[PDB]
Enzyme design. Structure first.
Site, PDB file in Angstrom:
ATOM      1  CE  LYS A 193     -10.284  13.001   3.745  1.00 18.22           C
ATOM      2  NZ  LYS A 193     -11.253  13.950   3.251  1.00 18.22           N
ATOM      3  CB  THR A 248      -9.334   2.269 -16.244  1.00 15.87           C
ATOM      4  OG1 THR A 248      -8.323   2.930 -16.387  1.00 15.87           O
ATOM      5  CG2 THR A 248      -9.077   0.776 -15.466  1.00 15.87           C
ATOM      6  CB  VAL A 293      -9.840  -0.479 -22.480  1.00 13.33           C
ATOM      7  CG1 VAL A 293      -9.207  -0.718 -24.027  1.00 13.33           C
ATOM      8  CG2 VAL A 293     -11.499  -1.072 -22.425  1.00 13.33           C
ATOM      9  NE  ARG A 327      -7.013 -16.157 -13.760  1.00 14.23           N
ATOM     10  CZ  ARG A 327      -6.056 -15.993 -12.917  1.00 14.23           C
ATOM     11  NH1 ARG A 327      -5.608 -14.496 -13.063  1.00 14.23           N
ATOM     12  NH2 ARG A 327      -5.496 -17.068 -12.913  1.00 14.23           N
ATOM     13  CB  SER A 380       0.501 -18.397 -10.856  1.00 18.32           C
ATOM     14  OG  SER A 380      -0.116 -17.386 -11.653  1.00 18.32           O
ATOM     15  CG  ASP A 437       3.444  -9.569 -22.078  1.00 18.43           C
ATOM     16  OD1 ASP A 437       2.600  -9.984 -22.834  1.00 18.43           O
ATOM     17  OD2 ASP A 437       3.790  -8.967 -20.782  1.00 18.43           O
TER      18      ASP A 437
END
Ligand SMILES: [Ba+2]
Ligand SMILES: [Ba+2]
Length: 327
Positions: A64, A93, A95, A141, A172, A248
């Site tokens: 390749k 994905t 989601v 964001r 962060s 969280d």
DNA sequence: CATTAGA
DNA sequence: TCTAATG
């Protein structure tokens, strides 16, 4: 970092595909190591052959490499990039709640789009339901300006329920960052540590607080030590409501906070680096503790930590503000 | 790399 | 129980 660039990029593109669209774990693992090693190599790869001398660099990938070096592309890559099914999978994905396994199945059934998903809300689980519900705001964001607003409230109710709580908003965010993706709350309480047989309520009590006041608005997942959800800032005096934000919260034995905090505060490199150093300095660091190293090869026995400092003192380093924990 | 949902 | 999905 740049001489090896196309190659690695191409390579990872190639890996990510086997992994997702196909279930080729190995192929997947194959692209990745190569991609790994080609990245370390100090020279510009000028041909497959050259590349090929590498470990994990076989015939297939070397082949390749030539095509790419010769022509600035790669058909497989152009074919995949085009592939509607494969595109579909990459998409579903995004989601929250949809991993690959699900993606394929959904596609299998004919559910390729966002709307598809709507029309079939039933085929989805609560997680995926919320994910769906908040697909936009999940992707958006989080301005620090809000992080600030959010952290404020959070600390308010925390203290509210029990004065003896300790909450840190890691990530962060913690490290200054102009914007964050979600909010990380590390939680602890004296009455909870290493042995002290839990107090799930410890967790429970707070989530409940947050909800009571409307900060929390959904539950993605609630367990006895790790809560995972969705929040929102009170939409002011109208004309401007706030986006749904992932949050969280997690319980921690007060006896493991700082490390965890240290550790979750990053950066991924600052960590790796400090960690590398505690090795020399005769230690071991990890998400929960810090153990002295014994010559025999290894050792145990958790030194005591009461602050981000202790860990620092231990490896005899410069206290680094989270501001400059960049690397 | 551990925690949770679910089936 | 296992297996997916998050971080
Ligand atoms: Ba080889
Ligand atoms: Ba996902």
């Amino acid at each position: 970092e740049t001489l090896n660039g196309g190659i690695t990029d191409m390579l990872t593109e190639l890996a990510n595909f086997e992994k997702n669209v196909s279930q080729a774990i190995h192929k997947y693992n194959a692209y990745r190591k190569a991609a790994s090693v080609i990245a370390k190599y100090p020279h510009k790869i000028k041909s497959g052959a050259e590349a090929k001398k590498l470990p994990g660099v076989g015939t297939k990938i070397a082949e390749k490499i030539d095509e790419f070096l010769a022509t600035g592309k790669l058909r497989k890559l152009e074919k995949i990039r085009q592939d509607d099914t494969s595109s579909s999978i990459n998409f579903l994905t995004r989601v929250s709640g949809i991993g690959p396994s699900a993606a394929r199945k959904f596609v299998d059934e004919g559910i390729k789009t966002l709307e598809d998903l709507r029309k079939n809300e039933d085929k989805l689980n609560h997680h995926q339901r919320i994910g769906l519900k908040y697909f936009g705001d999940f992707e958006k964001r989080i301005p620090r300006e809000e992080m600030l607003q959010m952290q404020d409230i959070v600390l308010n109710e925390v203290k509210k329920v029990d004065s003896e709580y300790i909450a840190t908003v890691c990530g962060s965010f913690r490290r200054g960052a102009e914007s964050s993706g979600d909010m990380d709350v590390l939680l602890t309480h004296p009455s909870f540590t290493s042995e002290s047989t839990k107090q799930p309520k410890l967790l429970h009590q707070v989530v409940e607080q947050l909800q009571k006041v409307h900060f929390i608005t959904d539950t993605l997942s609630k367990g006895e030590t790790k809560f995972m959800g969705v929040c929102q800032l009170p939409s002011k005096n109208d004309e401007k409501e706030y986006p749904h934000r992932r949050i969280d919260i997690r319980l921690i034995p007060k006896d493991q906070y700082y490390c965890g905090v240290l550790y979750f505060t990053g950066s991924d490199i600052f960590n790796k680096n400090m960690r590398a150093h505690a090795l020399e300095k005769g230690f071991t660091i990890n998400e929960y503790t810090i153990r002295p190293l014994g010559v025999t090869g290894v050792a145990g026995e958790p030194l005591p930590v009461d602050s981000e400092k202790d860990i620092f003192d231990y490896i005899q380093w410069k206290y680094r503000e989270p501001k400059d924990r960049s690397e």
